């Protein structure tokens, strides 16, 4: 399938070259997979989600996304226009308040929630969790992400926006999850993207158009935007039967566009997420 005039990041993940504007993907489109978006919530009523998004948990007085960040990330996973996996099911877990902040204890509870809650959902092609969040190093946050992954969920986490080594941030520094850095439309490392040995993959993260609250759209930048590209890609590849939750990160790295990014420091992988879809 071909989506013309797609956001640059969607076009990038199906291309061997930057500078194109059509997204190419297998029509299965993540059907039968599920992606949990652990964030500020999701505006499930947005027409871009086509009824495929729902809130499953909040730790606050509402499950509504009063911020926009979680809606944007969910849109990159799975919205009809802005999403990688256009037929996946989206489940929102509101661990972040409407100012975008959350206590680590609530974030940990949300991760353990997903590990159990997947047993209450129908995801025959597999389960992914997208974590566009993080703070300073925490062994307990890392361990929660490790448990979620161990439980059979493909966990993708943002590397962080500190232009520094991700070793000092969590859950970015957890080895067993998929830590995602950000690139721009010219195949440069995004100027804010963290780096380091713990990164597994880069995805589009500068000037990413997606859904926003109030039934709107907007373009924002961050490793928070790169992470859902990878989460959606995992869901898409699992639906195709090309990988599994336990190995999706390594499969994405194995099949990535290699050596095409600039300003990647020595010791950080030079790998850009790629669906290898051949029409």
From Swiss-Prot:
Ca(2+) 1 binds at residues 175, 177, 200. It is an enzyme of class 3 (hydrolase). GO terms for cellular component: extracellular region. Binds 2 calcium ions per subunit. Disulfide bonds join 34-123, 178-249. Belongs to the peptidase S8 family. This is Proteinase K. The gene is PROK. The chain holds residues 106 to 384 of 384 of the full protein.
């Amino acid at each position: 399938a071909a989506q013309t005039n797609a956001p640059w990041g969607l076009a990038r993940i199906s291309s061997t070259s930057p500078g194109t504007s059509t997204y190419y993907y297998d029509e299965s489109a993540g059907q039968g997979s599920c992606v949990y978006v652990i964030d500020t919530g999701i505006e499930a009523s947005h027409p871009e989600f086509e009824g495929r998004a729902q809130m499953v948990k909040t730790y606050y007085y509402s499950s509504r996304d009063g911020n926009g960040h979680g809606t944007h990330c969910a849109g990159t996973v799975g919205s009809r226009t802005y999403g990688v996996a256009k037929k996946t099911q989206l489940f929102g877990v509101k661990v972040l308040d409407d100012n975008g902040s959350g206590q680590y204890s609530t974030i940990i509870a949300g991760m353990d929630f997903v590990a159990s809650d997947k047993n209450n959902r129908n995801c025959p092609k597999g389960v992914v969790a997208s974590l566009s969040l993080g703070g300073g190093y925490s062994s307990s946050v890392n361990s929660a992400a490790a448990r979620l992954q161990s439980s059979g969920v493909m966990v993708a986490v943002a590397a962080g926006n500190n232009n520094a080594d991700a070793r000092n941030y969590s859950p970015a520094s957890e080895p067993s999850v998929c830590t995602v850095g950000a690139s721009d439309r010219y195949d440069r490392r995004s100027s804010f993207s963290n780096y380091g040995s713990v990164l597994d993959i880069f995805g589009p993260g500068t000037d990413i158009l997606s859904t926003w609250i109030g039934g709107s759209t907007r373009s924002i930048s961050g490793t928070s935007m790169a992470t859902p590209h990878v989460a959606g890609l995992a869901a898409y590849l699992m639906t195709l039967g090309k990988t599994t939750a336990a190995s999706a990160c390594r499969y994405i790295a194995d099949t990535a566009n290699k050596g095409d990014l600039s300003n990647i420091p020595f010791g950080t992988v030079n790998l850009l997420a790629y669906n290898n879809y051949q029409a």
